[PDB]
Point group: D2
Chain length 416, copies 4
């Protein structure tokens, strides 16, 4: 849900960077291409993708990381910052200042407008506002009842009249009525049409002149991908007070293309629709959105990994109970150590452990599993095969025998 | 590479459990079905999958977790333990005791036998052994040269004669020759055939009687999935000293079906092949393998998550520099706190923060982004909308103003 | 959309059988394995899959094709009839005979029940019947206006009272009322429940008060094989029970749900197919299974012809290039392989020999036959293992067809 | 296997054009968008994709189809010729004219060079030529025995010395020797390099000593669009350069590599296709692009016919069910829709009206036409908006076909 695949793909290019052995020009070129592929696949206009990834390439190649910041962390920064501007740079909230603050909603059939009208009403009501909705949708009068269905539970008033045929008349009667009732916010649901043709924009100019809304909000179906550009653009040109809600971002392969498309337009995206239910709407705040997108600041994720690790306890416990009965092997030790040195942030020491591994990599399975069998000629083979001395080998073995004695002789009443 | 998809799918059922709200019978039934799907998809025989998931279901449903172990952690344990037995229970290494320890390799064309012969020779040489290989493959005499190609770099002797036509003669001349040269280990590469027919098993019984190997090793192509069963079984019945290497597990959708199939047979799997290169072989140790498979003990993973998190530093840094100039918002605070309480393992307190969130969820975007605008009537709306008091609301705001004053007045010389 | 990939997976096992070189026992084991994989992935209960897939294996291993039928064609027939029986075997339509034929609809929240009430009203209305729906759904009010929303444009009476709190009362009142206005069919939408529990099935009350001709449980198909226990409990609790399975569109587990329900014997009357009023189709197992496996696809065959003709311009440019005397052995080799499928001129054995010869020519030779020396013809006959006579034969046939094209005129359609 | 999904993605855009209701400008924008997506996903350089995909858009928006060609067929022709030029335009085979025609093979480690040396020797040998390969690969010895391994069963002379440490010396010695034994073609395998750097291209040395007829760089196709810089650097450094791209089988980025190389103009002579000695095919852009897009698929059309006939048993059981007088309106409706595609009896407008009527019948009515009352016929004509006369018409046609079947005998094949 919500750009979804695009998220994973973008985050992975950033992980790759974090994990990269070093930052050369080849790393960048791959990053840029990883991003082009992810973007294009989410239906982002090709020209837009080129422009963005050429800026990212450029900034990475020729920009010195500020003091105490690696080339690597600065790349992560460049990508985050470029993507954020690519989706509108910053939040542009809806201001509620005027008394009845009037929001006029426009959109074609199947944009998800009716539903979005309910979502927006509920968003505001949840936050202590009195809301009235006015249904002036004469194009599919079933909308009055659909709004009743979505909104009655919340006692949010829905003014309508499935038996009125003048669209502008309807919108004015409604606004005046709900305005009489004392509301803070009025949301006006206008008639859809099949496409966003001249008729539709003309009808919005007319309804807007008559009711004088605080804001006109075009609802765009985000599954149309980059085709949202021209729809947003025509709208943004027919109204000095326009904003956009983009719906159906959940699961859609193409929502990325819609957001980037609308943002290329200048028009402000204020909310996104996120599913079919009344609460499935979230305000759009580019830097925060792009941050969830890229998997940044994932402290929750880190905690899940810890928790998951801890639930492995009965397994670890039985491992240890095996050690207590002396069933402890060179493989078990190999691992104990391996974990110890991968724990920063009976201790061997980094170099000595690095040597210890090298020695065991020259042992056979049967030796790792039954050290007891490791006689002297074996030791001289192990030493020869690992490029170390028979001394080192007997050292490692001593360490093993030491740790083995420990476990074999343990309280049988503890917890590691 | 290596069961790959099956790994991710199995690990996810275990993650689901770790994350589950509670452990009821419905959770189990879903786990079992998640595992059937993963298994069947990797070509594990259906009857085998039924038997395994019925045991897992049973143990989960009717088994009490030992003292101090949750139902949840005990399920994780049951799954790990069942899967481990399903793939052979424990390591059965190859013992090198006899002087020339002789390993006789059998397999059909395209099993990856020739390559596996080199991998096994190199595995042993790397570990300080003198190795000789004897190529008695009269069925595709190009094999002598292929072995030379793989093995010359290591100075591992390859006895052969692309111009000898008696297979058993060849294998005996070779063994005697390489035996004269002083080797610890001799690997004998017999002639393949098209399928594993009676001819092939008969020819192995004959060659085995003549050379008297320490072990006979059948090389099975793991991309055949569950069809490995009958091949392993026929072999295991034609020799009291048989083991198995399963090749091409890397990337293959069906290797899971091969391992489970061979293990159902009783025959010991000693190594797996892992790719085309000479080092692409690993010993098979069921509990360790099933442990990597299920993503258990992933301390490395945890460390990667930390490292990745740290590379986000230039971003966090610029966030903070915004706070220093007083550009700090209710959203920024909302987050600071949210992270603080998700950090165990200026502090508010769990209940107070839970209340704080509830209040902000009743604020609008413009309020969260510009607290300054929050006059008194707004506060009474916020308080009403959050089901709290105007006192609580002014409390939260005070906390905000406090934290805001802090940042606005900071050294501009530190690091958070 | 509906059972999408399950369909393709099954359809492919049949193509593989049609395409099979010969029908040994290993072709049956691969078919049986391929089917188990497709079914398990659609969330079919694994025990069911064994049961179905074993019978298919047996029937195919130990059954002699009737007279004039190959082993291949009988395997196809086996797979098709087993899947048909697997999914219910035969259609069991709703019977409208009584005046107010009354349908009681039950379901848990989110199963798609309320939408389904509407789709079904529309189904009948569209066919000439007068329909009225009684909304006795007191559990999630909003259901009443949802039915208004969906149904008003069809002037289908919707009786309800979003203020009535008694479910039995509302149902009784509504049925009586709608029955007054002389409707042929009454569909009653009952109150949902969070889950299908003793509370839900305890529908018996309403059913005992309104005496429905039929009681339809609406099941969300995305639950997959979990539909089994749900349909079973419901079928146990009523002698007059039928099922509608919804949300089959795009569903990964729809397969599992249909087979789950059918393994219960409760009849599947319709399937839901989308969110819109028309996304409902009556269920008819053999028709369904035939579309599923892509059987009798004349439409498919036609499309392929259409598409092949659309290539006309390209074909015509190739030919214009021949009239200009640019016509290679490559082009010829293709024209022949082509002609050996113009059915349903040179022959089938002479063509077979011509191939073999060209397969010993190099790329420059195939592309510039003009350059073919005398020694080259020796190299070729030698490499192809044929007589230089064979080689010069082919080269003549070439020279023929060539000049033939060179001396056509642009009146070539 | 080779360019797998790229092929399907492109082939589908053409099916969509063939299937298009009408050809407006939005059908071109979707085609152009669909192509950009397929190409970008195959790792084609994005700037190339713009360039190609813009030209395709223009040529289609502002070009009038020649006489007798529809807009549709011209779009198909456009897509096909652009992709062809995109991938090299026309075949450029290796020319064997000189006695020892000498081929110098270069490549970096893992590009598949040594295998490719062998596949190519085999390619020629198989066609009658005497071939000898000189292994001057001092960088990864093992290459010599690899060539022995691959080549001995063909008695293709392999000259080498895994002990010789001088690359130029070994090449010179080997060429001279092999040339003595009277080989038509000599293939020289040069030492690889970790990467294609000044060191690698500084091949000029060997080329100046043995004077090859041609120098072939072997490129690993899985590097995708990174092939461009590699082919460019190499082509700059030699007037006689050709490319072989390997590892195209299963490759996700093979597309990107072919277009990368072709945008350089260096001729692509062969492609590698697998690990085996026979997995090499000469590259011929128009042939390649035609297979890619699935053009001229007669084989495809045949397969579909074959598969449809294999359904005979099922068809025959359906019919046996008719002879028993079990033949519904469902069956009839199907027999008719069917017959309206028996081309290429009732008519096309009478059938159109029959549909409409049945579409107002319920499932019990379609399945038990016997039950169709007098009032039912009113309900139906009313719901279908036709005359009860129309309804009884259809019902007659039914009754006809029915008894007709009922009175066939089991001599029905
Ligand atoms: N998945 C999803 N569906 C949505 C969203 N918004 C609206 N829809 C659905 O889109 C369809 C049409 O929207 P609706 O408001 O009902 O009608 P409209 O006013 O004509 O566009 C309905 O099926 C809605 O459930 C969304 O954000 N996500
Ligand atoms: N990917 C992969 N390929 C393998 C493995 N083992 C062998 N192969 C390949 O399988 C093919 C045939 O195996 P090979 O040893 O060369 O011939 P054989 O003795 O006839 O089976 C070669 O292409 C090998 O590279 C493996 O573990 N992984
Ligand atoms: N895709 C799909 N969605 C459906 C189908 N039937 C119902 N739905 C959706 O399921 C959701 C819940 O169904 P609804 O009738 O509204 O509510 P219910 O009575 O509580 O189940 C609604 O969004 C419907 O649009 C179907 O057949 N296919
Ligand atoms: N799939 C595939 N693999 C190939 C192809 N050509 C070569 N290879 C493999 O690439 C690997 C390296 O090629 P090779 O000729 O052995 O070594 P090189 O000379 O160092 O490139 C070998 O495993 C080959 O089997 C090809 O066309 N397709």
């Amino acid at each position: 849900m919500v750009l979804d695949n695009l998220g994973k793909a973008l985050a992975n290019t950033l992980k790759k960077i974090a994990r990269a052995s070093s930052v050369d020009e080849a790393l960048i070129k791959e990053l840029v291409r990883d991003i082009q592929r992810a973007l294009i696949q989410a239906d982002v206009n090709v020209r837009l993708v080129l422009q963005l990834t050429r800026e990212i390439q450029r900034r990475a190649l020729e920009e010195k990381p500020p003091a105490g910041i690696s080339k690597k962390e600065h790349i992560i920064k460049i990508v985050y910052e470029e993507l954020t501007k690519f989706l509108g740079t910053e939040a542009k909230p809806i201001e509620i200042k005027e008394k009845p603050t009037i929001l006029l909603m426009v959109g074609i059939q199947g944009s998800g407008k009716t539903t979005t009208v309910a979502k927006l009403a509920r968003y505001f009501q949840k936050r202590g506002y009195k809301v009235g909705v006015v249904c002036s949708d004469t194009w599919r009068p079933g909308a009055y009842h659909q709004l009743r269905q979505l909104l009655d539970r919340y006692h949010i008033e829905v003014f309508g009249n499935p038996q009125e045929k003048d669209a502008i008349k309807l919108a004015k009667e409604g606004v005046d009525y709900f305005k009489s009732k004392g509301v803070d916010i009025i949301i006006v649901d206008t008639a859809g049409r099949h496409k966003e043709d001249k008729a539709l924009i003309e009808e919005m100019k007319q309804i807007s002149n008559v009711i004088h809304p605080h804001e006109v909000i075009l609802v765009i179906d985000g599954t149309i991908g980059q085709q949202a550009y021209n729809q947003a653009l025509a709208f943004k040109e027919a109204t000095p007070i326009g904003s956009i809600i983009v719906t159906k971002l959940d699961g859609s392969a193409k929502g990325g293309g819609a957001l980037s498309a609308v943002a290329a337009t200048g028009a402000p995206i204020k909310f996104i629709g996120t599913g079919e239910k009344i609460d499935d709407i979230e305000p759009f705040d580019p830097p925060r959105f792009v941050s969830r997108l890229l998997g940044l600041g994932d402290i929750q994720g880190l905690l899940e990994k810890f928790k998951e690790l801890e639930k492995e306890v009965e397994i670890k416990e039985e491992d240890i109970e095996r050690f207590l009965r002396g069933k402890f092997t060179l493989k078990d030790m190999y691992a104990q150590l391996e974990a110890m040195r991968k724990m920063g942030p009976i201790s061997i020491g980094e170099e000595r452990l690095k040597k210890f591994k090298v020695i065991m990599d020259s042992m056979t399975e049967e030796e790792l599993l039954n050290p007891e069998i490791i006689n002297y000629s074996r030791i001289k083979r192990i030493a020869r095969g690992s490029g170390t001395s028979t001394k080192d080998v007997k050292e490692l073995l001593d360490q093993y025998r030491q740790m083995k004695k420990l476990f074999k002789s343990m309280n049988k009443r503890q917890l590691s």
